[PDB]
Design a binder for these strands. Structure first.
Ligand SMILES: [Mg+2]
Ligand SMILES: [Mg+2]
Ligand SMILES: [Mg+2]
Ligand SMILES: [Mg+2]
Ligand SMILES: [Mg+2]
Ligand SMILES: [Mg+2]
Ligand SMILES: [Mg+2]
Ligand SMILES: [Mg+2]
Ligand SMILES: [Mg+2]
Ligand SMILES: [Mg+2]
Ligand SMILES: [Mg+2]
Ligand SMILES: [Mg+2]
Ligand SMILES: [Mg+2]
Ligand SMILES: [Mg+2]
Ligand SMILES: [Mg+2]
Ligand SMILES: [Mg+2]
Ligand SMILES: [Mg+2]
Ligand SMILES: [Mg+2]
Ligand SMILES: [Mg+2]
Lengths: 131, 256, 183
RNA sequence: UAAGGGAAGUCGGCAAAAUAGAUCCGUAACUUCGGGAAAAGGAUUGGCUCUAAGGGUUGGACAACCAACUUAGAACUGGUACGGACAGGGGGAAUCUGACUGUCUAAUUAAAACAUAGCAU
RNA sequence: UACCUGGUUGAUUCUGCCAGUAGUCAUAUGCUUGUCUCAAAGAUUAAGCCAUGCAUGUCUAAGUUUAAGCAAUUAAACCGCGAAACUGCGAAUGGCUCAUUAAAUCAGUUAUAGUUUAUUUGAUAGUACCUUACUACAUGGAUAACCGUGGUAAUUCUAGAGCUAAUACAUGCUAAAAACCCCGACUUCAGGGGUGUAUUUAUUAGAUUAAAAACCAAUGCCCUUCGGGGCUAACUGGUGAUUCAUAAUAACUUCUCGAAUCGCAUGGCCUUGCGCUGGCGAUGGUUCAUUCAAAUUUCUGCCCUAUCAACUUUCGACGGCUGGGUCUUGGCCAGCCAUGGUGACAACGGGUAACGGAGGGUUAGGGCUCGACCCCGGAGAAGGAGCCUGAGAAACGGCUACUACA
RNA sequence: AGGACUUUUACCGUGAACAAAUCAGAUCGCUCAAAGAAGGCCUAUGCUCGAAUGUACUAGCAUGGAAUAAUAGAAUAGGACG
RNA sequence: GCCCGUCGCUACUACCGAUUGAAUGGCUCAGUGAGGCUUCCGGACUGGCCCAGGGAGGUCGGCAACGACCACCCAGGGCCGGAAAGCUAUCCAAACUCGGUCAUUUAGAGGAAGUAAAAGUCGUAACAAGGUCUCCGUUGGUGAACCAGCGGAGGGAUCAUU
C-alpha cells in the first residue's frame, strides 16, 4: 500500500495540472512505464521525484538487494601497472538508490547517474535495468 | 582566519603577461570586473610593461588617476583594472586608441585602431533570461547587461554594442560559415571559418575551424569567438590570425 | 554543535582520525522548539549577514483554503498529530507537517459573504446565487469541522527558520488519512 | 556514636567498621580448558499519570465477552532522596602445606593429622 | 655516453660477496684560501623556553571641527591648513613551521538543477502602502574630543560632574496616470477598497503526439440571399533534463529597501516670489548578472606489515520516512521501522625517523631513491575546548576558561 | 531535429581540455661563461623583430577501428517476421 | 698437515629474570566538572504617554461660602517601553581523578648463550677404511669433544660374480 506510513504521501505541489507528475532525465534515457502509470511514491526517484541527474553516468553489476530502496553495485576494472606491463583485477562497491519502477535482482547489470548526496553513502540513481 | 587572497606571486603569474622573473617577488593582481583572471590583463602591465610611460609602480599610479586612460570610453582610476578581450583603451593625451586581441603566440598584443573602431565593441552573448519585470535581458562576455535585446539572439552570438550608449548595432548568429576566433585552449588567437558543429549532450561540444591555409582544427564553444559573418567586423593584428610553424617563422625572419 | 561527517565511522566500519579544529561554517546551532503562546520572535545572524527568525510560542498563523483560493489569518488552537514524535503533540510543539486545530471564524465569514449559503440590492444575491450553483455544496468532511468551530490544518512553513506558522486546510483523502490517525 | 589522622595500637587488623538485593556494563594472570568469576571495577533504583508488548473462548490479516501476572518505554514530581526498616560477599599480589568433597581427640588441640580416588607390591 | 678492476687457490674454472670507481641542488668536518658574477643558510634534535626592540594602520573638494591651534581674512554671520576624538574601512592579506594526518591530505577529472559571497563591473526601484503634536524650506535623544574633581604600587584601568556634532543610533510624508480583483445602494446595471519591492504560505499559467462526425449538460456567438459557413480567436522563452526564467491571484510580517548625507559649477524661465527649474561627481541602496572566491562533491590513483583475519552495530553501524539545524545537500542531529554495510582483489588494526604534489639526484631501455624548504593545496600558532565582532575566523601580534611554564 | 532499430566489456588510432616555474630546446657578443629575456637600426628625427616550440604516463571526455582476450543469444521454443 | 668441544682469563652484544618494576605518548569506561552559546524568569538603572491636582497675579457676578476668563512654577496615581547583575533547563565541553588497552623506551641480584682476542688446561670427535665408514630423524647416557639402541641415506671404502 502507498499510504503505509505515519504521514500522507507525498507529491509536494501537486494540488488535488491535477495529474500525476513525471519528467525525463534526458541524456537518452527513456522514462519507465511504471513511473508513468504507477501510484508509488519516492522523493528520490529521478523521474517522479525532485532529484536531477548531472555529472558522471556509470554502470556495473547488482550485488545486493537486501536493502529497501538502495542497491550495491560492483564495478570490476583492471589497473595497469608500469614496471610489470600487467594488470590487476580490482573492484569497487557503489551505493545507488533504486526507484520502485524497476524490478531488480542480484546479478543484473544497471546504469546509474550521479545526483546530489541522498544519504551518507548514496550518490547515484538507477536508470536502466538490462535483464 | 580564512578569506580571499590579496597578493600574487610573480612566478605563479599568468605566462602571457610576459613578466620579468627577477624584477621582484610579487606581481600585479587584478581586482575584479572584465575577468576571468585566466585570462585577463592588468592596466599597469599594459601601460608599463608594453608602453613604458609609466616606468614603474609610482608613475603608472600617477597616470591612472590623473584621469587620462579611458577603458571603453570610461574613466578608470584602478591601477590593476582587469582589461580584457575586445576592450578599447584610449589615451587622449597622445591621441590614439588600443584594442586587446590575442595573437598567434597566445598573448595580448599592442594593437592600434585609428579613429572609428573605438566607437564599438564585439561581445559574446553568455546569458539570455527574463528580467525583474518580465523584461528580456542579455549578458555579454564583459559583464555588460543589456535590458532590451533582439529576440533572435539566442546563445553564443556576437553583438556589436555601441561604446557611448550601449545599444546594439548588429549581431552575428553562431553558425557554420561565420568568421571565428579561438579565444582559449591550445589554439589561442587563431582566426578561421566554422565548418562543423557536432553536438554532445554533456556540455563539451566541439567546433571545427578552418584556417586561411586550409587547416582543420577543433575547439569547444567555450573558446570560439565569432568575429564576422562574411568578413571580420574589426581590424585583425599582423598575421591575420594565421599560425606558422617554427620553420616558416624562421624563414620569414631570414627573408626579412 | 557541528554538522561535519568527520566524526562518523566510515561505510566500511573504519574509524576516522582527527583532522582539524571545528570550523565556523560547519556549525551547527541549538534547535528552537516553537510552541503555542504569546509571540516571541528571536533573530539570529547567519553566514551571509542575513537574518533568521526563531519562532518561540507562536499563536496566530496564515492558512490557505486551496479549494477556492481563500487565505485568512486565524488562531492556532492545539496540535493534534505529528508524524515525527508523539511528545511534540503533548507539549504542543509547532513544526512543519504538524496537524493542528485552527479557528474557523475568518473562513466562515468569507464563505457566507461570498456564496450566501449557510454553513451550520438584487444584484448581490444573484451574484452569490450564481457562485453557489457553479461551485456546489462543500465536502461533508469539511462540513463537520465547521460547526465544531475548528479546522484541521497542516503547517507547511518552518517556524524555527522563517519565524512564521503558515499552512493549509486539510481536504480530500489527505483529510481522511489523518482522521484515521487521530482515532 | 564520635572531630582530624587512619594500624602509628598489638606477638598478630584480635574486635569493630566497611562491601552487600536486583538490572545493565566490564572483567586479568594462570589453567587440568571444566574454571578463576559475584574476579577486579562502575552506573541505575522512590511516588504519581500514562503508553506498549507478551493470552484464552465462540462464531468466518475479523468481530464480540473474558484474564492475571511479567517486561519495556516516557512525561511529571521531591531539601538528589529511593534494596530508605529488615535482609544482605570486603577485595587484590604472593609464599608454605594438604589435590578436592568427607572424618576425629563428647568436656582446652578440627589441623599440614585420618580418609579418599589414583599408583604399586 | 648499453664498460669495469683487486681479493678464497700451489695453480684453474665458478657461486658469491668485500673493496676499489664515478655522480649527488647532500649534510657535517679537517687543512688551505688572491680576484669577478650569482648565491643557499637553526629542517633533521627540542611544534623546546624566551629578556629586549620592531613587525598594522589609514583622509580626500567630496562623513562629524568653536583646539581657549596655526595662518591672511569680517563686530557678526564660518573656512585655507590642521591636532584630538567620534564614524567608515582594513586588521581573515602577508610571513613562519611541518607537529597531526595513510582514501585522510593531495593530484588530474566532474557537479552544485544542493549553496553563500564584503569588493569590482553593468544594469536596476514612480505606487494615494500609514505613524508621529504636526512639519519635508528638513524629526528626536544620547555620547565623545574638551573643562574640572579623583582612586590604586602598578596596565593601552577607569569613575563621578557640565556641555556639544553626524553618512554614529532611532523616527518619518511621498509620482501623476493607465490597467486588474473584491465590495457594491441603485427597477431588469454611481461609488468605495486593495494592487511597488523585501519575507512566508497556498493556487494558476509557463503549450504544441495524424486526421473526422454525434445525443450535449451548459449561453452556443457572429455572418442569416433566414440552407448553410466560420468561430470562444492571435501570440507564447530556455535547459540533455526541473515545480526553470518569468507572470498572475488570496493572504502574511517584532514590515527590509524605496537617500532627513557631502563637494564643485553655479546657469536658465516668468506670475519678481528670498518663486519654478538645471549638470558633474562622492557615499550609500533593492533585485539580477558578473568578479575575486569559498564550501561541499563524482571517478581514479598512496610506503611497510598477517608475529594484524575477521571489522562496524549497546550509545549510528547500512538504509527508508517525518522534522530540526545549516548558506545549502547529507545519520549532521531528534523521533519511528528494517537488518544491514566492509573483507583474502587484504577489510580492520599497527609502524612511518610520513604533510600531498608540481618536482631534485642518478640511470641505454625497464628502473632506484629523495621531496621540511623560493610555487599550488592542507593544518597549526605552549596543549585542548568555547565564543564575540565581522561578507569572510572557531582568528590567537582577538577574547574566555582549564593544564604546564613564566 | 524528433523517434525507432544497435550484445557488452578489454585493446589500439585520433581529437579536445590538461598553473607557472623545472626539463629538453630557438634567438640575442650580459667583455666569454654560469646566467637574463634581452636587444637591434638610423647621425638624428623615432623605427622595429622578439620574449618561440615540445612535454599531460595512469584516471576522465568524444569518435573510429573489429584482429586478438572474454560474455549473451532460438532446445519443455515462453524464438524472429507483416 | 689440518681440526673439534668442555674448562680457565679479558672484552663486547643480545636473551630470561623476583621486583603488583619505572617512564612517556595515543585511545577509552565512569565520576566531578571551569567556561561559553541557546533558553525561562528576573529586572537595578533609565525613557514616553495619560489621570485629575499644589504654590504664586489681573478682572467680573452673588447676602458669606463660591464660580467664570487671561498668563507662570511644582506634589501624587495609571499604562506602555529599553535594559545590566543574577537565575531556570538543555547543549558544546576544557580539566582532574580513577581504572582499561595499545605503542615505545628503560633499571634489575642472578642464570643461560653468542662473538672476538691467543703460543692457556684436558682429551683427539671429523678430514685416509682418520684407524669403530660418514651423515640424517628419534630416544637415552657421559668432563668434553661424543657414545649407544631403532629406522634411513651414500654425499662409500661396492656402478660387477653366471
Ligand atoms: Mg588558523
Ligand atoms: Mg580583477
Ligand atoms: Mg609499639
Ligand atoms: Mg575437644
Ligand atoms: Mg575447638
Ligand atoms: Mg593423608
Ligand atoms: Mg643496467
Ligand atoms: Mg674456498
Ligand atoms: Mg695466495
Ligand atoms: Mg661499494
Ligand atoms: Mg597566509
Ligand atoms: Mg546589479
Ligand atoms: Mg534512517
Ligand atoms: Mg531528511
Ligand atoms: Mg613527522
Ligand atoms: Mg621533522
Ligand atoms: Mg575563541
Ligand atoms: Mg669417512
Ligand atoms: Mg667424497
Amino acid at each position: 500500500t502507498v499510504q503505509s506510513e505515519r504521514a500522507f504521501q507525498k507529491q509536494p505541489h501537486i494540488f488535488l495540472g491535477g495529474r500525476r507528475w513525471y519528467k525525463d532525465v534526458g541524456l537518452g534515457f527513456r522514462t519507465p512505464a511504471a513511473a508513468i502509470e504507477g501510484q508509488y511514491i519516492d522523493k528520490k526517484c529521478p523521474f517522479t521525484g525532485q532529484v536531477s541527474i548531472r555529472g558522471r553516468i556509470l554502470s556495473g553489476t547488482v550485488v545486493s538487494t537486501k536493502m529497501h530502496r538502495t542497491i550495491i553495485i560492483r564495478r570490476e576494472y583492471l589497473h595497469f601497472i608500469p614496471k610489470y606491463n600487467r594488470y590487476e583485477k580490482r573492484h569497487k562497491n557503489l551505493a545507488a538508490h533504486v526507484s520502485p519502477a524497476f524490478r531488480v535482482e542480484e546479478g543484473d547489470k544497471v546504469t546509474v547517474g550521479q545526483c546530489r548526496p541522498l544519504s551518507k553513502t548514496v550518490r547515484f540513481n538507477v536508470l536502466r535495468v538490462l535483464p | 582566519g580564512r578569506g580571499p587572497k590579496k597578493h600574487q606571486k610573480r612566478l605563479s603569474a599568468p605566462s602571457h603577461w610576459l613578466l620579468d622573473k627577477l624584477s621582484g617577488v610579487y606581481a600585479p593582481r587584478p581586482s575584479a570586473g572584465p575577468h576571468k583572471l585566466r585570462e585577463c590583463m592588468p592596466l599597469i602591465v599594459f601601460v608599463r610593461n608594453r608602453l613604458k610611460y609609466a616606468l614603474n609602480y609610482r608613475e603608472t599610479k600617477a597616470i591612472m588617476m590623473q584621469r587620462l586612460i579611458k577603458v571603453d570610453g570610461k574613466v578608470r582610476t584602478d591601477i590593476t583594472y582587469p582589461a580584457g578581450f575586445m576592450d578599447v583603451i584610449t589615451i587622449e593625451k597622445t591621441g590614439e586608441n588600443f584594442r586587446l586581441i590575442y595573437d598567434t603566440k597566445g598573448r595580448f598584443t599592442v594593437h592600434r585602431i585609428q579613429d572609428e573602431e573605438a566607437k564599438y565593441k564585439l561581445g559574446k552573448v553568455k546569458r539570455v533570461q527574463l528580467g525583474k519585470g518580465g523584461i528580456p535581458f542579455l549578458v555579454t562576455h564583459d559583464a555588460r547587461t543589456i535590458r532590451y535585446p533582439d529576440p533572435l539572439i539566442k546563445v553564443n552570438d556576437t553583438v556589436k554594442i555601441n561604446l557611448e550608449t550601449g545599444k546594439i548595432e548588429d549581431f552575428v548568429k553562431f553558425d557554420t560559415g561565420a568568421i571565428a576566433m579561438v579565444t582559449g585552449g591550445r589554439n589561442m588567437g587563431r582566426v578561421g571559418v566554422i565548418t562543423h558543429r557536432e553536438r554532445h549532450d554533456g556540455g563539451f561540444n566541439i567546433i571545427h575551424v578552418k584556417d586561411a591555409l586550409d587547416n582543420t582544427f577543433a575547439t569547444r564553444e567555450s573558446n570560439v569567438f565569432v568575429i564576422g559573418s562574411e568578413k571580420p567586423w574589426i581590424s585583425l593584428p599582423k598575421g591575420k590570425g594565421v599560425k606558422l610553424s617554427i620553420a616558416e617563422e624562421r624563414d620569414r625572419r631570414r627573408a626579412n | 554543535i557541528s554538522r561535519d561527517s568527520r566524526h562518523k565511522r566510515s561505510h566500511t566500519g573504519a574509524k576516522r582520525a582527527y583532522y582539524r579544529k571545528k570550523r565556523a561554517f560547519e556549525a551547527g546551532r541549538q534547535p528552537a522548539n516553537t510552541r503555542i503562546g504569546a509571540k516571541r520572535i528571536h533573530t539570529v545572524r547567519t553566514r551571509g549577514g542575513n537574518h533568521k527568525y526563531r519562532a518561540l510560542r507562536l499563536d496566530s498563523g496564515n492558512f490557505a483554503w486551496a479549494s477556492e483560493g481563500c487565505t485568512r489569518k486565524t488562531r492556532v488552537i492545539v496540535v493534534a498529530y505529528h508524524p515525527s514524535n508523539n511528545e511534540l503533540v503533548r507539549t504542543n510543539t509547532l513544526t512543519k507537517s504538524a496537524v493542528v486545530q485552527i479557528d474557523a471564524a475568518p473562513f466562515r465569514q468569507w464563505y457566507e459573504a461570498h456564496y450566501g449559503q449557510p454553513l451550520g440590492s438584487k444584484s448581490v444575491e444573484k451574484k452569490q446565487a450564481e457562485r453557489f450553483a457553479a461551485a456546489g455544496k462543500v465536502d461533508p468532511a469539511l462540513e463537520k469541522q465547521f460547526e465544531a468551530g475548528r479546522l484541521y490544518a497542516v503547517i507547511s512553513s518552518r517556524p524555527g527558520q522563517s519565524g512564521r506558522c503558515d499552512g493549509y486546510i486539510l481536504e480530500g483523502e489527505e483529510l481522511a488519512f489523518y482522521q484515521r490517525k487521530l482515532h
